[PDB]
């Protein structure tokens, strides 16, 4: 989340091979703790996984059938 | 004590014998005219960051 916007916004806060860097980057490193704990955000999985929660979607591709079918019933 | 005599070495206090004048040149830390530790503080500085 976070993360994901902070790889691109990590990405060219890096200033030249002087030593401009690391007195940005160690604040940076601070940043990395932050997200270290952002990781802890994550901590816990939801629904299983690609493509096993996949395989539910397709399950329900095809539990959608019975559904466009029994209307086809209806008289 | 509390410590088994057996296991021991005579020690030296640094702190004790100086001179106050130069405690302060050892120990003592500010951002009065100095901050000459962020030449160290590498790699990372913060700097300094927020109070604390």
């Not at chain 1, 493509?51 to 399950?59: G, L, Y």
């Amino acid at each position: 989340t976070l993360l994901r916007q902070g790889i691109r916004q990590l990405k060219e806060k890096v200033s030249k091979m002087e030593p401009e860097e690391m007195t940005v980057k160690e604040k940076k490193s601070i940043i990395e703790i932050l997200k270290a704990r952002i990781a802890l955000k994550k901590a816990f999985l939801k629904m299983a996984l690609s493509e096993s929660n996949d395989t539910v979607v397709k399950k329900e591709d095809v539990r959608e059938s019975p559904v466009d079918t029994f209307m086809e019933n209806a008289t | 004590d509390g410590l088994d005599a057996t296991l021991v070495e005579y020690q030296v206090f640094d702190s004790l014998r100086l001179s106050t004048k130069q405690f302060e040149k050892k120990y003592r830390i500010d951002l009065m005219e100095d901050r000459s530790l962020s030449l160290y503080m590498e790699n990372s500085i913060e700097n300094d960051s927020s109070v604390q």
